[PDB]
Paper text:
Human manganese superoxide dismutase (MnSOD) is a CPET-based oxidoreductase found in the mitochondrial matrix that reduces ROS levels by eliminating O2•− with the unpaired electrons of the active site metal. The Mn ion is coordinated to inner-sphere residues His26, His74, His163, Asp159, and a single-oxygen species that could be either H2O or –OH (designated WAT1). The second sphere of MnSOD harbors five residues (His30, Tyr34, Gln143, Glu162, and Tyr166) and information about their protonation states would be of significant value in deciphering a catalytic mechanism.
The two data sets collected were from the same crystal treated with appropriate oxidizing and reducing chemicals and the redox conditions were maintained during each data collection. For the reduced resting state described by chain B of Mn2+SOD, Tyr166 and His30 now share the proton originating from Nε2(His30) with a LBHB, His30 is protonated on Nδ1, and Tyr34 is no longer ionized. Gln143 and WAT1 have undergone a proton transfer where WAT1 is now H2O and Gln143 is an amide anion. Gln143 forms SSHBs with WAT1 and Trp123 presumably to stabilize its ionized form. An SSHB of 1.5 Å is seen between the Oε1 of Gln143 and Dε1 of Trp123 in the reduced state. The third active site state is a six-coordinate Mn2+ with –OH-bound opposite Asp159 described by chain A of Mn2+SOD. Tyr166 and His30 share a LBHB and His30 is Nδ1 protonated, like the reduced resting state, while Tyr34 is ionized like the oxidized resting state.
Residue numbers in the entry:
A (entry chain B), B (entry chain A), C (entry chain A), D (entry chain B): 0 to 198
The structure:
Amino acid sequence: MKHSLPDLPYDYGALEPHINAQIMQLHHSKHHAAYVNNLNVTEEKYQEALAKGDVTAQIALQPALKFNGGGHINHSIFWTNLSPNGGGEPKGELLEAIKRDFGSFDKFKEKLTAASVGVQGSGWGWLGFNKERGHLQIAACPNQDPLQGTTGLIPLLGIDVWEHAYYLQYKNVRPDYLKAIWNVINWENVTERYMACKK
Amino acid sequence: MKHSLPDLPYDYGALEPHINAQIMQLHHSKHHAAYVNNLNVTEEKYQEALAKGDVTAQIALQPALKFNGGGHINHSIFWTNLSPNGGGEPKGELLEAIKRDFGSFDKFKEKLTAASVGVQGSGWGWLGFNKERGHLQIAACPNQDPLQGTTGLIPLLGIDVWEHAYYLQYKNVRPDYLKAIWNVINWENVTERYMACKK
Amino acid sequence: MKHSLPDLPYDYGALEPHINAQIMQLHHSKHHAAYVNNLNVTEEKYQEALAKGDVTAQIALQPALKFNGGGHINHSIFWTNLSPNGGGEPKGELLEAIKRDFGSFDKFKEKLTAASVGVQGSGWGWLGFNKERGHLQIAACPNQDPLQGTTGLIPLLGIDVWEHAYYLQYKNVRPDYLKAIWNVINWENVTERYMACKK
Amino acid sequence: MKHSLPDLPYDYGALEPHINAQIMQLHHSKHHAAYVNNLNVTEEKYQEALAKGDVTAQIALQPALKFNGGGHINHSIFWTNLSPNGGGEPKGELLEAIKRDFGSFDKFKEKLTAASVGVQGSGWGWLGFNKERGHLQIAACPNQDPLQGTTGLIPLLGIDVWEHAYYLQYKNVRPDYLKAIWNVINWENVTERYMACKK
Ligand SMILES: [K+]
Ligand SMILES: [K+]
Ligand SMILES: [Mn+2]
Ligand SMILES: [Mn+2]
Ligand SMILES: [Mn+2]
Ligand SMILES: [Mn+2]
C-alpha cells in the first residue's frame, strides 16, 4: 500500500533559468509530498472498506484516491520528463512518429501548447500513445486525473499547468511558461516510454 | 465480504396494478442480478490492484465499481421501499419532520416527483436525511451513483427513474409512473430508516 | 430559426422484425417530438437572457439546451442512419477507410458494438470522422450530448442505446438489439456523410 | 451583450497585510479582465449561433460561456465581499441566521474554511442562501462555475481558492490564506445580499 516520494534525479536549481529553483523545491517537497501522504492514507482506508464489503465507503473514497493517486502518478512522470540536459527535439522513431501523426515537430509543439494553454482551471497536457491505434495522440486532463487510468493512453510527456507549476515565476502568463519548458524536456526519457510499448 | 442478491419480501405480482409483474421480475431477477455479479467481479480485481499498489488499475476500475456497487445498493433499498400494503401517509416523527421541512405531506410529493421527473437520462430521486443539519432533503443522482456514497445524505426513500423501471407499462409518460408509485410506498420502512439515524 | 420534427423517410413498420413498429412510433412521434418542442421553448428563453446580458440565466439554461438540442440533433441523424433496404456492408472509400482504421469491416462492428454496450446508463455510440486527423474514430456520449458539439468529431453513424430504444422488444439484453441493428444500417447515408467532409 | 471590468472600490494595496497589493493588481487587472474579454467574445458568438439555429455551435460554446461568464460573476461579487474596513463578525439578522443554521459564528467559520480548503483543484467556497428552504447553506464550486447558475443558491460571500488568489503571498499554504481573509470580509455587503432576498 505504501507509496514514497521519489528523489529528484537533479538539483532543485538545475532547470534554471527556465524553471526557478524555488518552484521546483515547493513543487517536489510540498505539493507532491502531500499527494503521496494522502494517497497512503486513502489506500489504507480503502483496504478496510474492501475487507468489510462496505460499498458506500469504497465509493466515498473514490474522489480522494483519484486525486491523490493521480497526483502521485502525474508528478512522478513529470520529474523524469525534465532534465538539465534536456531541450532540442527527439530523434529516431519518436521523431518519425511525431511527424507522421502531427506533420512536423513544430506543429506538434503548437498542438500540445494549445492543449495546455486551453485547460480551464487546474490540469495537465499530455502527449500519449494509443497502443490500440498505434499512433500518438494529444490529450488534456483535469485536476490530477491521470492519463492512463482515465483514458487508456500511455503517457509519454506531461505538462503541468496547475498555477503552482508556474505562477511564482511567470505569474499568469501561461504561454511564457509553456515556451520555457521546451528547453528542459528530457527527450531521452520520452523516447524510452515510447519504445517501451512497441515490442 | 461477498455480496448477494437479496430476495424480494413479496411476490413479483404483489405490486399490481401499480407496477406489473413483468417489470418486477426483470428488475429484480435480471437487472439487479447483473449488478451484484459484476460488483463481485469488480471487487476481486480491485483487491488484486490494491495488493500490488497499482494506482492506475484502481482508478481504471472506479467507474465499474461505482456503477455496479451503486446499482446493488440502490436496488437493495428500493425493494424494501415498496410493499403491497403500502401507500397512504407516514405517521409519527417522519410525517412531522416532512411537514417541518416541506410544509405539508403533499408538498413533499410534489418536490420529490419534480426531482425525479427532472432527471435527464437515467437516475434516481431520493428523500434523504442530512445528519449534519438534522433535516430532510431531496436529491437526485445520475445512473447508479448511490446517495450516501456521493452526497453523504442518508437514504430514506428512493424512486428509480431508469426507463427499465417503467417503460413496459407506462411507456414515455414518466409522471404516470410517479403517480402510481405512491400507492405502494412502504412508509414503515421509510420511518425505520429515518429513526435509525436519530440519536 | 425554428426547429421542426423531421418526417420519417419510411413507415413506422418498415424496420421490422429488427425494430418493431411500436418502438419506432413512440421513438419518433413521442420522444423526438418532446425534444423538439422543449428545444424551441428553451431557445426562446435563452434569447431573452442573452438580450438582457443575464449570464446567470444563460448558465442555468445550459443543461436544458444541451439535453433537448442534443436530443433533436441525435435523433435527426439516427432516422437517416436506418433504412428498410439497409444492412450489408458499405462500399467505396467508406469501407476502405474502415479497413484502414479498424483492420476489417467486422472488427469495426465489434468495436462499435463494444462502445455502445459499454454505455453506463443512457447514451449513444458513434462512428465519427476526425477531420483534423483525417481518420475514423469511435466515441460514446452520455444522455443526449451530441457528438460534434461536445467532441468535434463529425457524426457518421449513431446507435441509440437509451433503454427506450430497445426495451419493449429486447428487454435488458442490449447485445440482442445491437445484433439486429446492423441489418437496417443505411450505409448509403453513412457514406454520404463521410464524403461530405472530405476535401 | 457588452460586459465591463468593474472598478475596484478601493486601492490595490488597501487589504494589506492580509492580501498584498501585487496579488490584488494581478487578480483584478489581469485575471478578471481576461474573463470579461472572453465572455464578450463568447456571447457575441452565441448570438450568431442562436440567430441561425445552429444547435451544435450553441452547445460547443457552453464550456467557454460558463467558464468566462462564471469568472466574471464570481470575481465581481468577490471584490464587493472584501473591504479595508472589513473584518469582525456580522450582526443583526445575518448573525442570527448564522447561529441558527450553523450553531455559532465560529462553527460557521470552521465549516466554510473546511469547504474552501477541501476544493480539489481550482474553485470557490460559498456561503449561500436557499430561498426555497429559507436557511443558509455552504457550497463549493469547481473552476468558475457560478453559485446561482449551477445550484440556485443566492451568493452572499465567496472565497476564491484558485492558486492565483494566494500563491504569491502564502505559496501553497491555503489554510494560512483562509485565516487571513477573515480580516477583510465586508460583512456590510454580505448583509445587504442577505437582506435583499427577505422581502
Ligand atoms: K407486482
Ligand atoms: K419498423
Ligand atoms: Mn503540480
Ligand atoms: Mn433499476
Ligand atoms: Mn432515443
Ligand atoms: Mn480568481
